[PDB]
């Protein structure tokens, strides 16, 4: 699809069989989801945003569908204001910026 | 242009004379630049994201050039870790996400 930016680029994703809403975010290196449960072990990661740094849980090789496109990669879990799909998964679905 | 997302989408902008580097950020409602002086009156605003909130100064009707595309809109100035071009100006240059 082609997504314009007059409104927030919010799309439906699916993870662990559950639908969630997430922001397609080209300003994010990584994908960060709100508190939820994921399989397997996690390791620590510190990430920085507009207001400073937070600690998040890093889960690797996680299955996630974004607008019907399948991706498998790293998903961070923590106190983000909104679920965000970062460049690590945007590249997997073939997403580009165009003007 | 078409910009892939293997790396951060950094571009050159021109504002208030100054040439600056900035990140094309589809997850940002607003454009936020590092501390600088801009012409006109301003009012304070709080903006939030990962890490919480920061206080910024809001300037309206500011002219910017992004990759040589002229765009006018609100520009926020404050202690952002990186210069961000948000949706309010991305729309003006006809920027879209495509996959």
């Amino acid at each position: 699809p082609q997504i314009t930016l007059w409104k927030r680029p919010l799309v439906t994703i699916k993870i662990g069989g559950q639908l969630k809403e997430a922001l397609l975010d080209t300003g994010a290196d990584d994908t960060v989801l709100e508190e939820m449960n994921l399989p397997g072990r996690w390791k620590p990661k510190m990430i920085g945003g507009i207001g400073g740094f937070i600690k998040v849980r890093q889960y690797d090789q996680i299955l996630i569908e974004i607008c019907g496109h399948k991706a498998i990669g790293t998903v961070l879990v923590g106190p983000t204001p909104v679920n965000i799909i970062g460049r690590n998964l945007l590249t997997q679905i073939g997403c580009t910026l165009n003007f | 242009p078409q910009i892939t997302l293997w790396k951060r989408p950094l571009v050159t902008i021109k504002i208030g004379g100054q040439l600056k580097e900035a990140l094309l950020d589809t997850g940002a409602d607003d454009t936020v630049l590092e501390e600088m002086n801009l012409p006109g009156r301003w009012k304070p605003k709080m903006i939030g994201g990962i890490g919480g909130f920061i206080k910024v100064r809001q300037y309206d009707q500011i002219l910017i050039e992004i990759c040589g595309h002229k765009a006018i809109g609100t520009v926020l100035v404050g202690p952002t870790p990186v210069n961000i071009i948000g949706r309010n100006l991305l729309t003006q240059i006809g920027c879209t996400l495509n996959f």
Binding site: A28, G86 | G86
Partner: peptide, 6 residues
């Protein structure tokens, strides 16, 4: 304003 960096 959801810029995020490692």
């Amino acid at each position: 304003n959801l810029l995020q960096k490692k």
